[PDB]
Design a protein around this ligand. Structure first.
Ligand code: CL
Ligand code: CL
Ligand code: CL
Ligand code: CL
Ligand code: CL
Ligand code: CL
Ligand code: CL
Lengths: 243, 244
């Protein structure tokens, strides 16, 4: 069976990541903005659901968000969430809302040329920072360390930046969109190096065998076709403050 | 959901070098299929254990036609350079993407066109824009160039597209980027591409709506992506250049 989402309330999980989902404290409440919030409003306007937007707790990992949805804590989850085989085993994903890949993030002046330097042991493993519960962790375990968790574990993007800037780690991995955004707008002393890797996609997380899958997919595809997803990307990502 | 091990799947494919390459060989005539799609079927079969009954769509079948044939029950899945679109998703489901995609303008070498702007500003009369009917290119033309008017030069296949360009009947057409590069680097050295990419999209395997095996297929495609098989296959079939 299938159905339309018109009139239905959806608990929509989101997770902090600038400029996908920007969390501001104002006065005394929090206010969400970004590409994800705008996307929700386009979808809401076309499909007629009621959006109950729920921010994942601090330090919730990407894997944690998916597992929370699988356990029924949300109806869908929307963000910079990579479609992976292990995740697809427990949840479904909408049609892609964006292409993706990763890049290596480091401090300027660090003598790293690209991924070969990581795979050839030029960097001690405990100086490669990896955010646990991310696709970057899967890649590392599959391609660098042959299964051993010998990376420096990171609980969040903020820990990743702080650890790089304090010299506790030498490199980490980020999705290309946000990697470009933060090194161009926030952390002028950090930079990207090497070719991009792990080509992938972002998708909206839904329950397996979801009643509303077609309605959501058809609307996501229409937003692509008519150039709304591009406009949104341009609105939130085309910007550079760093000199 | 459950497993397809031992289950026969009727797999629709559609000729498109080097995704699906059709050769006719003689003694009595027989047909041989090779290409990216055939290798992908092998990889999926090895992992998933289904039995593959590969069925080539009749000549001049359109992409939309293939999708409709599947919706009608003629195939269990269909695999090829098939663009995921909103209109198609109304009637079938699509697996996770097997490849990103976009389109380019195809034209004869030397033609004085700099890009999509010249198709809108009337430098090319509509009847000299060739558009393969039942393709995503048609949808884009209608959406972005002609305001819904089917005023183009209709084409029934890539062959007709190439023939028409080379005979000077049309000045431009649209092609997916992967095959556009392949064909202009290996087959038609006097055709070329121009202008920016457009219509960023994906290719997916076509399945029935609400298919019981959707998870099983998706997990396996993602695994091929993650372990680099899809990249290897792309390199194998597409990283070739015969034209000088
Ligand atoms: Cl590299
Ligand atoms: Cl990231
Ligand atoms: Cl599912
Ligand atoms: Cl252009
Ligand atoms: Cl094409
Ligand atoms: Cl030629
Ligand atoms: Cl469906």
């Amino acid at each position: 069976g299938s159905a339309r989402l018109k009139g239905i309330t959806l608990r929509i999980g989101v997770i902090e990541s600038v400029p996908f989902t920007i969390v501001a404290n104002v006065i005394n409440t929090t206010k969400l903005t970004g590409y994800v919030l705008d996307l929700i409003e386009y979808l809401r306007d076309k499909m007629g659901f009621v959006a109950d937007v729920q921010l994942a707790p601090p330090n919730t990992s990407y894997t944690g968000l998916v597992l929370a949805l699988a356990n029924g804590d949300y109806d869908i989850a929307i963000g910079d969430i990579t479609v992976t085989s292990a995740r697809r085993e427990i949840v479904a994903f909408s049609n892609s809302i964006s292409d993706n890949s990763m890049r290596i993030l480091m401090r300027k002046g660090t003598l790293i040329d690209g991924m070969d330097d990581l795979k050839n042991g030029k960097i001690p493993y405990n100086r490669i920072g990896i955010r646990i519960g991310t696709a970057g962790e899967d890649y590392y375990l599959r391609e660098i360390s042959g299964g051993s968790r010998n990376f420096y574990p990171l609980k969040s993007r903020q820990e990743m930046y702080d650890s790089l800037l304090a010299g506790i780690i030498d490199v980490s991995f980020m999705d290309i969109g946000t990697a470009e955004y933060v090194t161009n707008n926030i952390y002028c002393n950090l930079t990207l190096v090497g070719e991009d890797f792990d080509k992938s996609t972002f998708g909206i997380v839904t329950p397996k065998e979801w009643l509303y899958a077609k309605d959501l997919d058809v609307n996501i595809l229409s937003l692509r076709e008519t150039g709304i997803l591009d406009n949104l990307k341009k609105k939130w990502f085309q910007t550079k403050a760093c000199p």
